[PDB]
Design a protein around this ligand. Structure first.
Ligand code: FES
Ligand SMILES: [Mg+2]
Ligand SMILES: [Mg+2]
Ligand SMILES: [Mg+2]
Ligand SMILES: [Mg+2]
Ligand SMILES: [Mg+2]
Ligand SMILES: [Mg+2]
Ligand SMILES: [Mg+2]
Ligand SMILES: [Mg+2]
Lengths: 107, 137, 85, 72, 99, 96, 48, 99, 128, 122
RNA sequence: AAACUCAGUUGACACAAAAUAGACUACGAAAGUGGCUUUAACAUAUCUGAACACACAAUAGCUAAGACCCAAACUGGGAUUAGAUACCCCACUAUGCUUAGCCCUAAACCUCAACAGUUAAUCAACAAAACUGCUCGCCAGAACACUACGAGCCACAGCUUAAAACUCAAA
């Protein structure tokens, strides 16, 4: 239940002092804001600790290195799949709102 | 029975156990995640200090203390000390939204110790003292 | 002075500390403690506190009204039933 | 309309029913409308107690064969 | 004796019906677009329900179905609007096919 | 003249106005069991009316009663009393 | 009625005479003001 | 606000247009339309209701008069001389099926 | 001040009120009531003593008497809460209102005005 | 008027508890209170540790003393309760039953605020 | 960097400030009022009515005595800087608090006076739609000017009232 606006704004016929002082008018706009914008560091830390304790000899850290590499590959795959899937959208939402726009005036 | 996220009530007859101990008797790992340092202290169920570890004591100095990596390092050190003092399962109480809040827990676990509970005891005055003034940069 | 380990305490299920921490942080956020601490770090002078509160109230009103409109119009996202004409 | 009182009481007492309205037929009569007609004729008989009228109308429709189910 | 508008309205099925909420009506699918079923139930507007996943193919133009109405017209007044915004379609729940 | 014209009356089809769950009931600072139904299980925070679903009057009554009990020693402050965690949930809050 | 009702009750008020007995009766008794509510507005009294 | 005189009353928040006024106004409108058609004027049917665009177009074509159910490019009437040609003849009557 | 044993205005007329337990009498007395009840008793006493028609309260006389009771209450209050600016303002405003009422009464019905002044111990002083 | 004294007494045995209740009701009657009823809500653990008169308390007995008193007696009774050592915490409140439950027909909803802004086109 | 060897757990403990409730919009004339309990208590059956008096008036500030957790003008130190009398970091004081007086200023602004009334033929622009009746206060180019003088004031680097001369065709 949206908060009431009865008697909240400084208006004539409103005895009490204003409750809200909206910087912008409280009128629904016909658009929505544009969607607003490290990975796999555990495996990296494991591999780097193994390197530190083994003098970075990859010979004795093969499992950790392979896990790190596969994790990076999966991170790339996740980025790609996420991008394609992301491609409701603000564009669609704005189109719908345009179809049914706000009317803050009299026709 | 079914799993409940709430802790058992002291004085109530509960079935949960850890290492043949009741919940009240599990040692407590007080984490303190300040803005630029993460301290850890594992006390017994009778507030007997067992292990200590802090970002500074781990060698980090200046800004490097306030890093999740430093928190993990301190947690691992504290967990090792507690493990050699004979601690398996711990109750974690962390007071502070410092950067080490969760990385300290991760380091503590990677040190071997198991966590049974997580408690937030961040001090939140009910409008008590007046904090220092804002920062204009 | 209250009993310890009853307030803001969560029990990890199977040892998934990450899940337990997520639940705890959800609790704190929904109760507002996180925002309260972030704001209490530095004293917010009463005028600024009132301005921020009023701004957040207006933002919530606008957001809730926009959400109501979006839900109300969501049923009209169908395909055009009179394509062409 | 004066029948609105009876309509509201009937809907509150028996719910919507099971005989769906067919708004396409101009001459359609809903179970509630039949109840209203029977209540109206009973009132025209000269019975003034509202609740007695209601129970009498319900029983008259039951005798007709209308299955008026009460909501609670 | 010529019935007037008042009498017609008084005896009309819509008037005989009370609030449309939770009222069962008989609609006639008059248009279908993929899985959307546009149903006319005698009211001003039409309700665009979805073809039920069960017995879906049985639903076709002219099919007579049963609806549980929720609003004869879907409208609401949003913040700042001087007039109600309408979606120009009724709201109903498609129960099934009448026989 | 004409009996088919509309008449001037109230709206007989009006639904009953919904009554808050506590409507008509006496909220008492001693009923810690009831007062604990509107406090966060973890932090003890009092729920807003958008969560409780109470009228303004009853929300104010619950607030005053909770504060009075907390300061008079009937009810814990920083947390909900564990003994009441299994009471019927009456708050539209989902922590999970 | 109000004065009449009060008249009846005053017979039960604790005085300097029936003080020991009433105190002991109070210590014996247990008064429960706790009762929860349900979403459907139905009281839930505790069991004793 | 201006439609109030023609509204018989609000049934459960649903306006009921006074069909008596509707009958009189429709009588006058049909009389005017027929008179223009007899006098051989140009009758243009305007309506943006896509649900009836096709029906309006077909009706206009069969009756021998013109129809514009599509997007109304600015100036079809004010700028007609330029958009079509200086000697174009504008409609003698415009009939709105949806104002 | 009326005697603490005095009964309240809602009980001084109850039949048989004197044939009840002294505990009931003490409960219904001013001894177990807030200051508003005592002020009501004072108001009714002044009315009986002064106004020709106590049952008429819309009269300027009844208004003046009630306002005088309120002035008494505010003065008693300030005597202890000397630093109550709000109630000091109320006292001054009520004195001004009573002066206006007394002016109107003196202009309209002199005999009644004289009786009001004598009964309430008010000395009408023409404004400078 | 009608007051209710909620009294958290030190956790003790029946003899001392009865003596303390007797002393408290005696103090009420001395200050001029007509004690109407005494109720025992029963001993229970204090929600939070209370330190009264150089003693940390975690359990206590809860008692309700409904009485009638002159207004000026409330302050004196509070002072005496503060003096008393067996009282972990005393509080005198106006009895809830003196207040009347106003009948709430329903939560009349506030419709959307209208005419906040001029209908001029912007 | 400077600063401290004070840091963590547990317990005891304020004359400081009053999370959540509050997505509530109430109280008061305005300033203001959001921990709890109690006492007293929120003027006017007609509206306006102070440079013409009375009573109030946030924060800051003075006087005298206490409290002092924290915050903090000034001050000192550490940085940053061409400089840094600032912004950033640390410490600490007046001060914020209680008592008794003073002081009587705020963008004290909802920049929208009080009362009664209308939504009809709109309305420079923006802002918080346009007006009617009645009353009081106020305004008459900019700047000089929250100024000088005179006057009053517990005010002594103050406050209230407050001009004029020169200047300009703008503001
Ligand atoms: S709903 Fe009736 S008191 Fe709130
Ligand atoms: Mg006046
Ligand atoms: Mg003035
Ligand atoms: Mg001042
Ligand atoms: Mg100091
Ligand atoms: Mg202000
Ligand atoms: Mg000045
Ligand atoms: Mg000056
Ligand atoms: Mg001078």
């Amino acid at each position: 239940a949206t908060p009431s606006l009865r008697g909240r704004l400084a208006r004539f016929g409103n005895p009490r002092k204003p409750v809200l002082k909206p910087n912008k008018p409280l009128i629904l706009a016909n658009r929505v804001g544009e969607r607003r914008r490290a990975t796999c560091i555990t495996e990296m830390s494991v591999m780097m600790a193994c390197w530190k304790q083994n003098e970075f000899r990859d010979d004795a850290c093969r499992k950790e290195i392979q896990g790190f590499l596969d994790c990076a590959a999966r991170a790339q795959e996740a980025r790609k799949m996420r991008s394609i899937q992301e491609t409701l959208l603000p564009n669609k939402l704005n189109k719908l709102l345009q179809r049914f726009p706000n009317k803050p005036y009299l026709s | 029975t079914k799993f409940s996220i709430y802790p058992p009530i002291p004085g109530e007859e509960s079935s949960l156990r850890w290492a043949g101990k009741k919940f009240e008797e599990i040692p407590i790992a007080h984490i303190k995640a300040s803005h630029n340092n993460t301290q850890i202290q594992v006390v017994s169920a009778s507030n007997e200090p067992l292990a200590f570890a802090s970002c500074g004591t781990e060698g980090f100095r200046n800004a490097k203390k306030g890093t999740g990596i430093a928190a993990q390092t301190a947690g691992i050190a504290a967990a090792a000390r507690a493990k050699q003092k004979g601690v398996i399962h711990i109750r974690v109480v962390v007071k502070g939204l410092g950067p080490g809040r969760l990385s300290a827990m991760h380091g503590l676990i990677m040190g071997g110790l198991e966590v049974i509970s997580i408690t937030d005891n961040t001090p939140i005055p009910h409008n008590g003292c007046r904090p220092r003034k804002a920062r204009k940069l | 002075k209250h009993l310890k380990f009853i307030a803001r305490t969560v029990m990890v299920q199977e040892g998934n500390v990450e899940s337990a921490y997520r639940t705890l942080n959800r609790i704190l956020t929904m109760d507002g403690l996180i925002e309260d601490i972030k704001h209490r770090r530095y004293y917010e002078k009463p005028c600024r506190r009132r301005q921020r509160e009023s701004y957040e109230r207006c933002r919530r009103i606008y957001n809730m009204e926009m959400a109501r409109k979006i839900n109300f119009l969501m049923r009209k996202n169908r395909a055009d039933p009179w394509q062409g004409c | 309309y004066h029948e609105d009182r009876i309509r509201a009481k009937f809907y509150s007492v028996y719910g919507s029913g099971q005989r769906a309205f067919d708004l396409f037929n101009p001459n359609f009569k809903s179970t509630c409308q039949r109840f209203v007609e029977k209540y109206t004729e009973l009132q025209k008989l000269g019975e003034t107690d509202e609740e007695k009228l209601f129970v009498e109308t319900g029983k008259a429709l039951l005798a007709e064969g209308v299955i008026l189910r009460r909501v609670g | 004796n010529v019935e007037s508008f008042a009498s017609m309205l008084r005896h009309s099925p819509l008037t005989q019906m009370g609030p449309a909420k939770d009222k069962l009506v008989i609609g006639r699918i008059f248009h279908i677009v993929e899985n959307d079923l546009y149903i006319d139930f005698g009211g001003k507007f039409h309700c665009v329900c979805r073809r039920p996943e069960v017995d879906g193919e049985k639903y076709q133009k002219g099919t007579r179905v049963r609806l549980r109405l929720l609003d004869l017209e879907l409208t609401s007044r949003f913040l700042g609007a001087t007039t109600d915004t309408t979606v120009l379609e009724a709201n109903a729940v498609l129960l099934g096919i009448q026989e | 003249s004409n009996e088919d014209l509309p008449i001037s009356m109230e709206n007989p089809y009006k639904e009953p106005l919904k009554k808050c769950i506590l409507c008509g009931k006496h909220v008492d600072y001693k009923n810690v069991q009831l007062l604990s139904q509107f406090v966060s299980p973890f932090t003890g925070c009092i729920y807003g009316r958008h969560i409780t679903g109470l009228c303004g009057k009853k929300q104010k009554e619950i607030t005053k009663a909770i504060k009075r009990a907390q300061i008079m020693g009937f009810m814990p402050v920083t947390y909900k009393d564990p003994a009441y965690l299994k009471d019927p949930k009456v708050c539209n809050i989902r922590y999970r | 009625r109000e004065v009449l009702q009060l008249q009846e009750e005053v017979k039960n008020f604790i005085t300097r005479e029936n003080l020991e007995a009433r105190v002991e009766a109070a210590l014996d008794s247990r008064k429960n003001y706790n009762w929860a509510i349900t979403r459907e507005g139905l009281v839930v009294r505790p069991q004793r | 606000r201006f439609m109030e005189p023609y509204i018989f009353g609000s049934r459960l928040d649903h306006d009921i247009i006074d069909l008596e006024q509707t009958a009189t106004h429709l009588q006058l409108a049909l009389n005017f339309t027929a008179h223009m058609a007899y006098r051989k004027g140009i009758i243009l049917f305007i309506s943006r209701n896509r649900q009836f665009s096709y029906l309006i177009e077909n009706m206009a074509r069969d009756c021998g008069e013109y129809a514009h159910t599509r997007y109304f490019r600015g100036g079809m009437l004010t700028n007609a001389r330029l958009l079509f040609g200086p000697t174009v003849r504008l409609p003698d009557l415009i009939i709105f099926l949806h104002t | 001040d009326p005697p603490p044993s005095t009964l309240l205005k809602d009980y001084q007329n109850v039949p048989g009120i004197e044939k009840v337990d002294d505990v009931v009498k003490r409960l219904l007395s001013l001894e177990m009531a807030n200051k508003k009840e005592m002020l009501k008793i004072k108001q009714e006493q002044f009315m009986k003593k002064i106004v020709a028609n106590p049952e008429d309260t819309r009269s300027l006389e009844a208004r003046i008497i009630a306002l005088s009771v309120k002035i008494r209450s505010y003065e008693e209050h300030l005597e202890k809460h000397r630093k109550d600016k709000a109630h000091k303002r109320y006292l001054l405003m009520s004195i001004d209102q009573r002066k206006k009422m007394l002016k109107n009464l003196r202009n309209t019905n002199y005999d009644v005005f004289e009786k009001i002044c004598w009964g309430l111990g008010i000395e009408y002083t023409f404004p400078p | 008027p009608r007051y209710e004294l909620a009294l958290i007494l030190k956790a003790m045995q029946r003899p001392e508890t009865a003596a303390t209740l007797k002393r408290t009701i005696e103090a009420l009657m001395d200050r001029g209170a007509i004690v109407r009823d005494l109720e025992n809500l029963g001993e229970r653990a204090l929600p939070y540790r209370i330190s009264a008169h150089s003693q940390q308390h975690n359990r206590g007995g809860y008692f309700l003393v409904d009485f009638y008193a002159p207004t000026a007696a409330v302050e004196s009774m509070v002072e005496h309760l503060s003096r008393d050592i067996d009282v972990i915490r005393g509080n005198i409140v106006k009895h809830p039953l003196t207040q009347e439950l106003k009948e709430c027909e329903g939560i009349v909803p506030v419709p959307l605020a209208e005419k906040l802004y001029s209908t001029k086109k912007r």
